Amino acid sequence: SVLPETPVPFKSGTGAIDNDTVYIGLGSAGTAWYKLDTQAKDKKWTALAAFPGGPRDQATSAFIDGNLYVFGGIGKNSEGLTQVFNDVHKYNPKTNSWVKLMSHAPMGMAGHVTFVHNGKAYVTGGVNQNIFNGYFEDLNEAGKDSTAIDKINAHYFDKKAEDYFFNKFLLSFDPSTQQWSYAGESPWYGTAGAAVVNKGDKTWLINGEAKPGLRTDAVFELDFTGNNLKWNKLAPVSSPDGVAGGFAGISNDSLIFAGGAGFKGSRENYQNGKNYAHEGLKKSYSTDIHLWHNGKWDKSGELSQGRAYGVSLPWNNSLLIIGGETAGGKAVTDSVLITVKDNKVTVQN
Template sequence: MKFTQSLLAVSVLGLTAFTAQAAQYPDLPVGIKSGAGALIGDTVYVGLGSGGDKFYSLNLKEKDAQWQELAAFPGGTRNQPVAAGIDGKLYVFGGFQNNDVADNQVINDAYSYDPATNTWTKLDTRSPRAAVGASGVTDHGKVYFVGGINQEIWNGLFQDVKKASSGLDKEADKDKIAAATKPIFDAYFNLRAQDFFFSSEIVSYEPATNTWRNEGYFPYSGRAGASVGINNDKLLVVNGEIKAGLRTDGTAQGTITKDGVKDWKKLGDLPAPKGYDAQDGIAGGMGGYTNGHFIVTGGANFPGARANYAKGINDAHRTGGLKKTYHSDFYALDAQHGTWKIIGNYPKNIAYGVALPYENKLLFVGGETDGGAALTEVRTVSFDGKKLVVEE
């Protein structure tokens, strides 16, 4: 998106002003949602997800730079992998893909990409916990993984679905497939949150030593799709999915030590978004640190699911036909008091994109919006404690 002049729209929300500014970077060549991305120096790398096996790079310092297509990712198409940039290389972990076993199978391999040679290498390692649904963040040469789905339960679900629909045509026999697989999905969605066995372990990977490490346990239930950030050895975890279709509004913070992540404490819950009586929690939010302040926006949920679950309805989001809803409210953490406030809105509802801290700003790349449409846009966002600036 390109504008020839800056756009300015200021509104006061408490002590917070919102400012829109002109776009800085070109759009992606294709819409990318449920992909992954990372920074290496001044170059951002984004790919996979709805981008197939493609990865692209953009030099953020080069004037009039355009996205460059890299060598194709050799692991095939992947949704929801984790990516990280460490010591000049890009690392990609896990994800799920359709393969000969069944659709949507969790993969636990790892690859590195060397920008100097435009080549990928499959690493001689595998993640000890599913990287799908995990949120990754780097610190001191390590990638920290928070949460993640249970590989055995997830893969088994879709293997059972494939078996039940064997011999049926996906297009011609839709009704028969729905009837054959309904008992399988019903049993899955009726599990309690704790019976999904989402990972509560904090796992790290250090490329320099090719070593995985258990960094301790997250005490507030396993989750998928949380927003995470690290600042001054503090690991912040915001919301996420605690079972299929059900989110938490909780946030927590732990301290990174040489012996793992410890001294976890619960922070305030996210407030209800504008127009809603309650906060259902968000998964796939876009967040990170800017000028020392953690902010998060977007994400998706099923409004009413938490209330259903509190009533003992385990299949909380399908009951009553709750609609998947995307959001745009920006939340900022008051680090001193551990509380949150709404500071403005993103220009559109957004989730499942790439958010990366860069030069005291956050770089938002791709994502999806209402109806699941993949986005190509690239924007910067910043917050200094008083003013929220969002690129238009």
Template structure:
């Protein structure tokens, strides 16, 4: 596959851990490191990002963004409320209307932590998989913000080490699949997720099928699998593993925060972050699998043709945790986090 990276107008400020979606020939992006800001870029004019109606809720990272006809839904994420003063998993969701340039609160009672989860819209319903355990996340943030730990770096570090030194199953990430009826605004449980619960997976959506590429299975440890779920008539009708990147690269450590999109009918997974050595550490029961390891921000670009993954090239630089959307003109890549931890303003159109 011959790739071209065409520069798009840069963001006015860096975006990481935010969300994005496309509507016709426009790209909308915001939240994460941009706070409540919400911007739009017309891909036909490509002049500059235009400010749109700001997000009305608590500013948040790693929310679930589900595009629908005419707009998108933004659910959950992690944000700091004025009441608590530390980050918690949020349980509200909003709808953004492109034509009206307006936000509407649609739920304040998400029944499970969806931080870092994924979703798909089918007919008048949204389906959600994965997500961080709210009780555990909120509890850790409360501990770390306590005065005694703020005053003692050693105690704070010990708390983190204890939390990170657990096997996958003890994190109790959301193992259920939930449905949200957009008309009645009611929740229901569809089924148990047949795959290991994920956070930060790459997402592809098409015709009632949700495909998840890798992502975390516990803090610091990535999945090596590509998983596919198919829904019909409100039910989970099939699930299967697809070929995985590790089959092409045995040293592959998995990816979290990768850029994902469709280019000329091919699935693209670009960038992402991982810890070299974390897989072997976990296999030898070193459950704090990324302890002492440096996070790698890859520049690799992978392409899936329906049969296998192949290495297709390199990004202009290694990065992760930005946003990517499929458009009629190519895959728009928006912002990201650099290896230095900075929120990036650079944007590209991959064709």
């Protein structure tokens, strides 16, 4: 809308901005990537070279030093089964060409976040590759046996959050060496589907799944201002249950957090000892827009329709939201711009 409609319905994808040029791809777009020059009079999505690593849901991407890097995601292995990837691809916009890097992340990456700090891509969060991949291996083995399927599901969902080993480590990828380093770790727990925002020496990790079907309303701050990385629990948002797949950006010096999806009542079920916290519940999509302004959160506006699992980009001191999924799991093609004209939010779509 605020940009032309994406060429296909676009959920679970990824994207990046390099100054005034927006790049989007993957998710329900398959191997397709597109770019758009936001400063053109006749704004247009231009199809780029196809992603060579197959379709990916829940990949991330970072622009660093003129090149676009894509990390992980969920897709098919050589046997045709759903799995989590741990790879990195590089796209060179000057040559419209992709290469896969010889680079091995220590953890699979799906539901992870990625941000750029001091010329490096930093990654945290995501599901555990062995648990996630094993679920699909088991379902494949079960075939059409519903009793076998029920057993697999029962075992899978009846665990405490810690037993899913969501990634609490902080990893850094250096484009110059293509190597992965230990950068730190959360004193608390990892999530899958948190929203990330970075501004200078601060990064924020907002909500996310703590385990399959259970989200957190937590907000973590990573403070890189000192000699040692410091982690802080900030005031929560989207309480009590939290969302996953929300959108986030910074407008002025105030964080914007919008949308996301979740299961209402699930936190209370888990707190009450039901590990399978979302059993029987229907997924709902948030319309809330929260602003973190002068160090405090407030519900400041709303989206017209609930939305999760799209692309969030900084643009013109605003949060640019592109695509996503709405009620019924329907992918959308439109874009929204959330700007703060203090101390209040405005929404364009």
